[model samples]
Target: SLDVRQSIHSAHAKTLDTQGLRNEFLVEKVFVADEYTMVYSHIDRIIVGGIMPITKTVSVGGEVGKQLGVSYFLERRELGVINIGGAGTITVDGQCYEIGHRDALYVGKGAKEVVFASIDTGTPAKFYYNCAPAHTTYPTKKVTPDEVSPVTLGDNLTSNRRTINKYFVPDVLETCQLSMGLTELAPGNLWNTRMEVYFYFNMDDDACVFHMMGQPQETRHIVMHNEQAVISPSWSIHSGVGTKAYTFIWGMVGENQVF
Candidate 1:
């Protein structure tokens, strides 16, 4: 089982050196050619990771529990996964969902069994996921990028334009405690601005989003590359500018209040 560890906070980071900061906060590597990358954050028991099945369909089974200290990974948590590569399939308790690029799927609480693998292993598919605690069960569902209704905000004038797709939410399907969505930035639009307290950005292969965090008046930028994520505390403003148009999936566990 995956061992449960204590949460982390910036205040507890005062003693950390550069390497410690890199190890604790920044996730540099997300995908290995034929492997999966999983990181369980003590900072709220949130799990963030990536999956790549290039040669064969990769599966998730008992190994997840051995690392999480639970009967199964979802025994105490719900999950949100977004496929960012080729076509793939994820099965939970025998039910399967075929996911394509930019597609999302949510597996709610109480799903004792789960598995993930690519449909065609030759090109492989990458699955990015976030798992967090849940108190109730919700039907598992898949959301295709083109099928999901999007919330378009910002304008060309502001250059902060983007389309946000809410994949797992109270309005989408019933879930205990997770809000997940994917945002696609409009071309020539680099800034992703939300009045909300925190933000994250995943740019393209060649570009990066210099994410600005902290109080709006007192901000700091964290340079990010493709598939990378950063945690922004409740008080920080997360916005970024990219060298080109891109997409990113944002998932959060706390702050249940409707936006």
Candidate 2:
């Protein structure tokens, strides 16, 4: 049902070779037949995985609580689910919600019973998920494509033309601190004009950094440790805010300079 890949120190991780990374962060296979496969990391990152129910209705809880030392899975966690395959149904408690392709479902904390199933066996529903620890229960929600409009930017000829379908975001729905979405490109295109990867952190005690990113319509932040790293996508507007310390080293990629 799961694989806790574990974690490593920043300095120690940097020195490792290829296999070390495999041992640390990577989860080769995610979705399996009629079951859920999850990978948890100690980086405090999202529990990444997928579930595909062939003909039988599959579930993932009970034992999960045993590992989490909680009464149930969602008792201390919030789950963001996005269907990447055919139609499906995510039944929570006693209510059943129909989930279409690319649709998202945010199951808040304290939910005791959760279940999954596909609409038909011809084209099974594959649910890609990101589960993170939650402090409080927000609200269970189901978001579809037609419900929320997509945000388009740049130009189709520029290869930066993109339409972002925000699913489990604050604007669409509420969560403890989880946001997920799908960015659709125009035929053949990328994110932005220039890309930059920033690897910097704070040195002062009792301090942390929140590196903000993504489009202007949906700006988000990720907490960084003393020696953490963050990637700034080519289509993102990156910025940072922290306490006391303000020095950083940034390596720019892609094409730069304009008239």
Candidate 3:
């Protein structure tokens, strides 16, 4: 299912209460078993969602084409995906790429077919994706996070220590507007910045985070469970404090990227 969410102005956001804030900003359910679920945001025309293939290979199909007014979903958009679950295969226009846990794939614009499936059903692959508008096509590339040198920042004494690993970006690879990376917070640290969408992973079953969003001056918090995501608007500040140290994948595409 596709959820259409309108952009909220920073001024208008200041008027929202807890429930109202959640209704506008929080994306509670992003992944579903044996199906594809997505949220289409009007902020920068980005689609954030999850694809888990258990019984059958799933495709976005013509339904998404009709909504985007294109022949296919990627006809005018680029896609970035990272597997957070088990091993899987993402076939783009018949070219299959093996995506293992924490591996990422970038699909350029103009692909006619995009299919997702898991190598094993016992532990199905959970694919988290981000889509953004694209005017040109770039070569599709699969990247292993460990193959790239990560930038380690923050100090242990500050309790904000973490390692930033960039998977897809202009420096590493070419993409229209989509940039993605993963950050691992140390055991004593817990804080992160903005993203068009954030998928928090590597947390215990009982682990959760208090995600601080909304305008910086006028902030609100959302309690996020493991393996869930929250959409961050361009006008809002995205940060969080978790019950335990964890890792999260962040991706964004818009008019600006401050980080």
Candidate 4:
């Protein structure tokens, strides 16, 4: 069902120039008005993108079945979302979850109908997400910033000091999880080795970061602007150092999450 809009391999990746790298790895725009932006990365089969609903209430799963060769989008998958824009409502099969800025929502497998809309037309809801396949079904949950326990790390001399607002804790998901989190830098590790995508935001117009990827010995960087994202393959490492402080959401998924 999934086509081959596959990401680049390491050998092919390291050979590209700046624009080539941008074409191969950069999600130049993660959000568009009144539509869902879904970029499928073959790495770990993780999908990352944004959904911005302005005047229209947007739906995600109907046509997606054609692309997925299933009855519905979540028929065999799970989704994790974080709203970086204004307030919004995410309706899963009829139940509504009001998502605000920095709020997290996890929709487990077999969710038949999923839709998105904003609380106000002026300030549209920008719902950024990372989704992966799941064999077992789990309950859907909404996690607010208040519900999370943050871990603070990094050094002042390193200029990477920040709080890691962890959202996929035991009380939140209650099963093998969808590891979605917010990293505020200026502010912000490796995990049980899930394929990761870092969606960065909260920077001034003049600010940017050099997102690191590839093998340590053959490392490369992409200059990331505000609201941009870089896909990190499992074969490579993921890290970044910015010109100024910023925030990012990391979506990681693979076979095993328990650690």
In lDDT terms, which candidate is top? 3
**Tens digits of lDDT, candidate 3, 60-167:** 755778877888889898899989989999998888999999899999987888899999999999999999989999998998977656988888776678999989
Give a tens-digit lDDT track for model 2, residues 1-259: 4566544444454465655543554345556879887766554545666788997887877777777778887888888887877899999887899998878788999888779899998998878777777889998999888876777876856655656666766567677666666554454443233433333322455665566655665565665554333445455566665543433333232322110
Task: Flag the better candidate by lDDT, 2 or 4.
Answer: 4
- Model 3 superposed RMSD (Cα): 1.6
lDDT of each: 0.70, 0.65, 0.85, 0.80
Clash count (model 1, backbone only)? 10
lDDT at 185, model 4? 67
Model 3, TM vs. native: 0.94
lDDT: worst 10-residue window of model 4: 185-194
Q: Give the per-residue lDDT of model 4 (tens digit) for 24-104.
A: 678888888998887787887777788999989989886886687788888888888899999999999999999987887
lDDT at position 3, candidate 2: 68
The residue pairs in collision within model 4 are 161-187
Estimated TM-score for each candidate: 0.86, 0.70, 0.94, 0.92
- Candidate 2 Cα RMSD after full superposition onto the native fold (Å): 13.0
* Model 1, span 67-171: residue lDDT tens: 777778788788888888788888888898888877888887788877778878666778888888877777788877666789899898988789988877777
Worst 10 residues of 1 by lDDT: 194-203
Model 4: residues with Cα > 4 Å off, grouped in runs:
1-4, 169-171, 175-177, 187-193
